[PDB]
């Protein structure tokens, strides 16, 4: 009755939290994702954790969850803990449209989820979400945007990001090779192939192990693009060509 409670609500004797820190260390394992914008357009990098050769791959869609006509997300953590959040956040964006008949701005959608994720940490002793995820989107006020999410209900605006523990070293690369508004959408793509070359310890960067999804602004359509497996391979051979070209100076 009383001795079976787990007490996932009390602070630590240090004077901090105790259960959320256990949850945030699960995100670093089992997944590695990033996204980069500096101009018109935004990308998302994914990684196949399970790449076994007997899967169907007939979903024809993946970790990139198109939750709106202008937004999508990239999730990493407990897998079906996301499916509660993706179905919920899809309906928050849709009940906004019923109320105003105007598409949801990308800022206050993130605030709607982070109030839900905090509410399990505030009261109850319910197990919190072991889920961190990203955000991409276009709006009428700032254009292209990136947002990081946390299990604590904290968020923030970003221009180059990270999820996985292997991608903690990618932050050191992203401080070294980032620009200020020169995102031609080959320079942003060749950078993303360059990051996942060094970070992902799978050698030679097989095209089936990764995935890239982009969002470009059309006249009024906001085309969300999940690019196919053929043009991944020529982008890898482009990056392998640049590695053989740059080593001529040595």
């Amino acid at each position: 009755s009383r001795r079976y409670d787990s007490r996932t609500t009390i602070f630590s004797p240090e004077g901090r939290l105790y259960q959320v820190e256990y949850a945030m260390e699960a995100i670093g394992h089992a997944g590695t994702c990033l996204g980069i914008l500096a101009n018109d357009g935004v990308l998302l990098a994914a990684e196949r954790r399970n790449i076994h050769k007997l899967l169907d791959e007939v979903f024809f869609s993946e970790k990139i969850y198109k939750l709106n006509e202008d937004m999508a997300c990239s999730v990493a953590g407990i897998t079906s803990d996301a499916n509660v959040l993706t179905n919920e956040l899809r309906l928050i964006a849709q009940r906004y449209l019923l109320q105003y008949q105007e598409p949801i701005p990308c800022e206050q959608l993130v605030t709607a989820l982070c109030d839900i994720k905090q509410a399990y940490t505030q009261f109850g002793g319910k197990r919190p979400f072991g889920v961190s995820l990203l955000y991409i989107g276009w709006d009428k006020h700032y254009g292209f945007q990136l947002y990081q999410s946390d299990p604590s209900g904290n968020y923030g605006g970003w221009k180059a990001t990270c999820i996985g523990n292997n991608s903690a070293a990618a932050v050191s690369m992203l401080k070294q090779d980032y620009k200020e508004g020169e995102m031609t959408l080959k320079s942003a793509l060749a950078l993303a192939i360059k990051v996942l070359n060094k970070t992902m310890d799978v050698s030679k960067l097989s095209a089936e192990k990764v995935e890239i999804a982009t969002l470009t602004r059309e006249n009024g359509k906001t085309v969300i693009r999940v690019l196919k497996q053929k043009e991944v391979e020529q982008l890898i051979k482009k990056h392998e060509e640049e590695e053989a070209k740059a080593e001529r100076e040595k």
Partner: peptide, 16 residues
């Protein structure tokens, strides 16, 4: 009205 989940995270970060 106890309603408390008996499955919590490990200190390693797993669900036992």
């Amino acid at each position: 009205g106890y309603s408390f989940s008996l499955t919590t995270f490990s200190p390693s970060g797993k669900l036992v």
